[PDB]
Amino acid sequence: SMSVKKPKRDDSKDLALCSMILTEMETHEDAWPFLLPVNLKLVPGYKKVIKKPMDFSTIREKLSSGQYPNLETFALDVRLVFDNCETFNEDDSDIGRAGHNMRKYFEKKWTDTFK
């Protein structure tokens, strides 16, 4: 509360460490469904159904331009990529499986880096 603060966690490396995680996600072999925004002209149903589209290139641009206030807003966009994927894709599809694999990969890096 006012004039009463928990000890200051060092957040000065967060930006660099989120960039590294994002590099590792970008270079994973199962990243291909997620690298670029879904083409809303060419994929019937996507625009109406997926209310907040997100992809790795969009996260990379947000990251690079100071649009994440803190590391949690960064994790929320990564998870949005996978949540969208589960919303639109059957679990038993190449893209559905890609999404589950990438989410697992992400969540391990996230825990090992920050928890």
UniProtKB/Swiss-Prot annotation:
Bilayer-spanning residue ranges: none
Bromo domain ranges (all copies): 9-113
Protein's cellular compartments: Nucleus
Distribution of this protein across tissues and organs: Expressed at varying levels in several tissues, whereas a smaller transcript was expressed specifically in testis.
Subunit structure: Component of the BRF-1 ISWI chromatin remodeling complex, at least composed of SMARCA1 and BAZ2B, which regulates the spacing of histone octamers on the DNA template to facilitate access to DNA. Within the BRF-1 ISWI chromatin remodeling complex interacts with SMARCA1; the interaction is direct. Component of the BRF-5 ISWI chromatin remodeling complex, at least composed of SMARCA5/SNF2H and BAZ2B, which regulates the spacing of histone octamers on the DNA template to facilitate access to DNA.
Function: Regulatory subunit of the ATP-dependent BRF-1 and BRF-5 ISWI chromatin remodeling complexes, which form ordered nucleosome arrays on chromatin and facilitate access to DNA during DNA-templated processes such as DNA replication, transcription, and repair. Both complexes regulate the spacing of nucleosomes along the chromatin and have the ability to slide mononucleosomes to the center of a DNA template. The BRF-1 ISWI chromatin remodeling complex has a lower ATP hydrolysis rate than the BRF-5 ISWI chromatin remodeling complex.
UniProt record similarity statement: Belongs to the WAL family.
Listed name of the protein: Bromodomain adjacent to zinc finger domain protein 2B
Positions spanned in the full protein: 2054 to 2166 of 2168
